[PDB]
């Protein structure tokens, strides 16, 4: 017996690992093409995310990838200083299709499972076997689990990147991984596993309007600008 | 389609790992309850054995065990200085039954899969969950492979521990993992992945007879003793 509510949900999980010959490494879990919610540099996990203990299968998958990259750098690609890989896993029922993306300093490679199409761009050296990744059998084996353990997180994150859940002051702050943009009529961009903040400051210049757009499809403006730093939700347009 | 000649062969593979808090470690592969043919301290592999490359699945199984033991010592058993584990895997067709044996300085534990019977002897501390081992799904998953890749090795090792393949001089040397014993009417015992040698020397004492017994079931004597170190095969009794 399986769950219908979790089988209906369709989302993409994005596992990405970066490794530098110098020593640097970074491995992250993202949801619905958003910003990362789980970050390793114990991981930095978001408040609306599942416990570290309940993310173990995804944890090892990422560690296997660090090792596989450290190994590519250890055996070949000696001029290349920074290799990187991204697995874009789409869940549509109990089946996963993971597209693999690789990036060295001199080459970019993409592969997609059904089309089997390998797109290679760059002067650099890469293997078409390496282009297709590994360890996908771990996500493909743990569909029911990963889906059920992430179903609350993946839709509560969407219900947070909503118009009535963003805070404009022009400093725009939405406590959701869903990416937004701010337009003025200097830009300080940042992040955190829990909050995303973009600030647009004018050096004495009169703007009178501040636009805000979301990747889930919405637009808003906050007018008139006040002398104080007062909090307000975006106003529809 | 499977192989009939490899399905017929019934043998026991014995995977054993030793780890000391001080740093020491030793992981070995044995066959038909004999002496070790593969030893890690690149492994020391026997001449009649399969290539390191064709033993990879058994290689990782052993490494998982080193880690699991290093972990038991890292989280508990602080008075205990040396933990050890042995998996006695019996292959009867395409099914494996692996009995697990553990040994700390203060406790001995045995477990057997069907009877599920856990035998614990000692004053020491052990977990009945730990007693049952892990990673057996690797040998149970790779039956066809392990069997086909080891079928020549497991029976050519038996056909070497034969009477007409032992060399008595009293120094007895049989180039086979099958264990033997030497009886005189000082004893220097040793080993190597390729040869087993037992020497029995007398300080001017007259023996006139030297007995040799094998674990496959045979007995022999070499008489009369010569003044020179001449090589001869055991003579039936």
């Amino acid at each position: 017996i399986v769950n219908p509510d979790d089988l209906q949900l369709t989302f993409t999980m994005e596992f990405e690992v970066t490794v530098t010959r110098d020593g640097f490494h970074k491995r992250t879990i993202s949801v619905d093409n958003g910003r990362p919610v789980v970050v390793w540099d114990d991981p930095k996990i978001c408040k609306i995310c599942p416990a570290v203990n309940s993310i173990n299968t995804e944890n090892i998958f990422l560690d296997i990838q660090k090792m596989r990259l450290n190994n590519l750098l250890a055996q070949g690609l000696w001029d290349i200083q920074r290799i990187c890989v991204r697995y874009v896993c789409l869940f549509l029922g109990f089946d996963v299709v993971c597209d693999v993306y690789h990036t060295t300093d001199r080459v970019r490679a993409a592969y997609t499972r059904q089309t089997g199409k390998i797109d290679i761009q760059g002067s650099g050296t890469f293997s078409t076997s390496d282009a297709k990744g590994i360890g996908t059998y771990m996500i493909e084996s743990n569909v029911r689990e990963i889906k059920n353990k992430w179903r609350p997180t993946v839709q509560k994150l969407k219900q947070l990147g909503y118009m009535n859940e963003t805070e404009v002051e022009c400093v725009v702050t939405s406590r959701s991984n869903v990416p937004f943009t701010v337009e003025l009529s200097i830009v300080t961009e940042e992040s955190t596993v829990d909050c995303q903040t973009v600030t647009v400051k004018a050096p004495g210049s009169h703007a009178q309007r501040c636009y805000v757009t979301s990747s889930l499809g919405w637009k808003g403006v906050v007018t008139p600008p006040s002398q104080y730093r007062t909090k307000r939700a975006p106003v529809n347009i | 389609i499977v192989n009939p000649d490899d399905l017929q062969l019934t043998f026991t593979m014995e995977f054993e790992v030793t780890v000391t808090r001080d740093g020491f470690h030793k992981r070995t592969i044995s066959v038909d309850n004999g002496r070790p043919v593969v030893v890690w301290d690149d492994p020391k592999i026997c001449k009649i054995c399969p290539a390191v490359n064709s033993i990879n699945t058994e290689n990782i199984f052993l490494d998982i065990q080193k880690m699991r033991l290093n972990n038991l010592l890292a989280q508990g058993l602080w008075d205990i200085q040396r933990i050890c584990v042995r998996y006695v895997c019996l292959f009867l067709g395409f099914d494996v039954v692996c009995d697990v044996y553990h040994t700390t300085d203060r406790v001995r534990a045995a477990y057997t899969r069907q009877t599920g019977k856990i035998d614990i002897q000692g004053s020491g501390t052990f977990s009945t969950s730990d007693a049952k081992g892990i990673g057996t799904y690797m040998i149970e998953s790779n039956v066809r492979e392990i069997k086909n890749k080891w079928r020549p090795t497991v029976q050519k090792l038996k056909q070497l521990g034969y009477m007409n393949e032992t060399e008595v001089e009293c120094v007895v040397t049989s180039r086979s993992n099958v264990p033997f014993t030497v009886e005189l009417s000082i004893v220097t015992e040793e080993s190597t992945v390729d040869c087993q040698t037992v020497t029995v020397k007398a300080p001017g004492s007259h023996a006139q007879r030297c007995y040799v017994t094998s674990s496959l079931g045979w007995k022999g004597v070499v008489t009369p003793p010569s003044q020179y170190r001449t090589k001869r095969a055991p003579v039936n009794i």
Partner: peptide
């Protein structure tokens, strides 16, 4: 370790084959 990566290589093959043989 190229040894573990060989085990994972082989495991994806066992997974891809076991699913195809149902």
């Amino acid at each position: 370790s190229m040894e573990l990566l060989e085990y994972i290589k082989r495991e994806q093959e066992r997974w891809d084959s076991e699913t195809k043989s149902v």
